[PDB]
Write a protein that binds this ligand. Structure first.
Ligand code: Q0Z
Length: 295
């Protein structure tokens, strides 16, 4: 007997995740099976994506030594059956208003900022870099949330100071880079490049920094196949390239530039995408997804 999700109060929704109040000091952090591509949440869910990404997050939490917001096991009796395997019980924290980002490679808004200004989030970079260039050391490239449906706004370190305090900002920078460095080296050892990552921190009652997000999922982090890493061109998304290629190919009937909501995916593409998630999970964790809890 587990409670119903309807026993808990919904407090937040993201594109592909949900948050619920369990009591005054705990929340329920729920991954869904929805997937986003080209800034659209697609009509077609990916089977088991919520469970797979939750397993991934749990693995990486176990790998990292930093305090985190997990407040119970993946089978905690407070978790409803309906979300079992894709929801975790977490401690309620005072969240810090910073999207902490580390970039090991230059792509996306990071590359664009560099191409426009020669710098990213206050970091003046060497000349001659381009798409998927390795950054060494990794860059702290923080961002702030914007309006609904808008991309996060890249900001520099001074902006983070103004948001959370000088000493805390230094802590966010150091911890974000330490955590990314550890995770990325682990993943690369297993054949996957984590090109970048984003996560949020909160502060507990004693004032300590606590990692409080999904961590190193293909949604929070660019997953790349290391065996095909080729600086100078756009790398395939380990998990979403089948989806991307179909949507923008000759069979979808959809024009990406038209900004109209994309059509549903072929079942075959959704199944193939689930397999990519399982492959990435099992390679990185060294575990079997068949052992991960579910309904
Ligand atoms: N441990 C915490 N304590 C207090 N607040 C949060 C919190 C609030 N918002 N978010 C972002 C978010 C995470 C998942 C699903 C969403 F819809 C939104 C996280 C957390 Cl993780």
């Amino acid at each position: 007997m587990r409670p119903s999700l309807s026993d808990y109060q919904h407090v937040a929704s993201g594109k592909v995740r949900e948050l619920y109040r369990v009591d005054d000091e705990h929340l329920l952090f729920v991954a869904t099976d929805r997937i986003s591509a080209f800034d659209f949440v697609l009509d077609t869910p990916i089977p088991d994506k919520g469970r797979i990404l939750t397993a991934m997050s749990v693995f990486f939490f176990g790998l990292l030594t930093v305090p985190n917001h997990l407040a119970g096991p993946p089978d905690d009796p407070r978790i409803p059956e309906e979300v079992l395997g894709r929801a975790l019980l977490v401690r309620r924290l005072d969240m810090l208003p910073v999207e902490c980002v580390a970039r090991g490679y230059l792509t996306g808004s990071g590359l664009l900022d560099y191409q426009r200004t020669g710098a990213v989030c206050g970091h003046v970079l060497p000349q001659g870099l381009g798409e998927a260039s390795r950054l060494d050391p990794p860059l702290f490239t923080p961002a702030t949330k914007a309006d609904i449906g808008e991309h996060d706004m890249n900001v520099d370190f001074a902006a983070v100071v103004g948001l959370v305090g000088a000493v805390r900002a230094n802590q966010l920078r150091d911890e974000t880079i330490k955590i990314y460095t550890r995770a990325a080296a682990h993943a690369l050892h297993k054949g996957i490049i984590l090109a970048d990552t984003k996560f949020e921190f909160g502060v507990d009652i004693e004032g300590n920094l606590v990692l409080a997000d999904e961590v190193f999922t293909p949604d929070s982090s660019r997953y790349w196949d290391a065996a095909h890493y080729q600086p100078g061109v756009v790398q395939d998304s380990f998990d979403k390239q089948f989806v991307r290629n179909w949507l923008t190919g000759p069979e979808s009937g959809w024009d990406r530039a038209s900004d109209t909501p994309p059509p549903p995916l072929p079942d075959e593409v959704a199944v193939a995408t689930r397999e990519r998630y399982i492959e990435a999970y099992e390679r990185i964790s060294g575990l079997s997804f068949s052992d991960w809890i579910g309904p």
